[PDB]
Design a protein around this nucleic acid. Structure first.
Ligand SMILES: Nc1ncnc2c1ncn2[C@@H]1O[C@H](COP(=O)(O)OP(=O)(O)OP(=O)(O)O)[C@@H](O)[C@H]1O
Ligand SMILES: [Mg+2]
Length: 239
DNA sequence: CCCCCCCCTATCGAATCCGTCTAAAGTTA
């Protein structure tokens, strides 16, 4: 479970067997966060023979924007030899969970622990749009700051406990609402829990309609990394 | 920190010539 093999391109020099890492994605609409997650799942789900890793992955769906036809098309167009049996065998490992509210999210977080401890093979976790319910619970609590964000703080505590308990690697998805620009609006604790930021940007022109820019910083070094990549029907490819 | 629009005005400035018609009246050995 070394970070050099996971993504040597985005992660320049952070290679070590990870005891736990938190990654989050930030970007406006239609930039490619979901496509990047699809590429990561494709590279993490295939058999070891076809450049895969053969390790478990769990996907929490909150935006309700997960598309399975796109995922199966990406997996079919990624590998070399394609068949129904092998694709079924590969997709027998993907895990998907649905949520509807912050309280329901916390209940699902707590409930997952049974299967989670029953499976030591689980090593990678995916969460998307943890700020989907930001406005709802910000308005429910009124002016009382403590009244709002409280369930989100409890959820962050539970996630941190799990990830530092059973050595997970986590990728998160955020949203751009207000205003290298960045204006945080979540709880302070989860802001501290982050390790790197993946700022997502998109170029307007049709020539660069497939090329996008990524900026990453390290909390302990404040070093900037730039990356250009091209999207495709077969998945995501780099420059 | 959040999300959407407004409106007409005012006159100026002169040029360029053509084309002819109609005859009448005798005088002094
Ligand atoms: N087959 C394809 N070939 C090339 N580009 C594609 C293909 N399918 C989708 N795309 C591109 O992928 C881009 C990313 O779309 P997507 O909805 O996954 O973005 P996202 O930023 O992850 O999502 P969101 O806007 O919901 O935050 C789209 O702008 C689209 O142009
Ligand atoms: Mg998306």
């Amino acid at each position: 479970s070394s970070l050099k093999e996971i993504e040597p391109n985005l992660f320049a020099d952070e290679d070590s067997p990870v005891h736990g890492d938190i990654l989050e994605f930030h970007g406006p609409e239609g930039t490619g966060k979901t496509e990047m997650l699809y590429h990561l799942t494709a590279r993490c789900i295939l058999p070891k023979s076809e450049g895969g890793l053969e390790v478990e992955v769990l996907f929490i769906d909150t935006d309700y924007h997960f598309d399975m036809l796109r995922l199966v098309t990406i997996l079919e167009h990624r590998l070399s030899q394609s068949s129904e049996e092998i694709i079924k065998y590969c997709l027998g490992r993907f895990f998907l969970v649905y949520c509807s509210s912050s309280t329901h999210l916390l209940l699902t977080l707590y409930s997952l622990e049974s299967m989670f401890c029953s499976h030591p093979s689980l090593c990678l976790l995916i969460l998307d749009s943890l700020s989907a319910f930001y406005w709802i619970d910000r308005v429910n609590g009124g002016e009382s700051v403590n009244l709002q964000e409280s369930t989100l703080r409890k959820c962050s505590q539970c996630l941190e406990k799990l990830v530092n308990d059973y050595r997970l690697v986590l990728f998160a998805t955020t949203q751009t609402i207000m205003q290298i620009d960045y204006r945080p609006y979540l709880c302070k604790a989860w802001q501290q829990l982050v390790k790197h930021r993946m700022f997502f940007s998109k170029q307007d022109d049709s020539q660069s309609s497939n090329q996008f820019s990524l900026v990453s910083r390290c909390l302990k070094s404040n070093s900037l990394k730039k990356h250009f990549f091209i999207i495709g029907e077969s998945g995501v490819e780099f420059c």
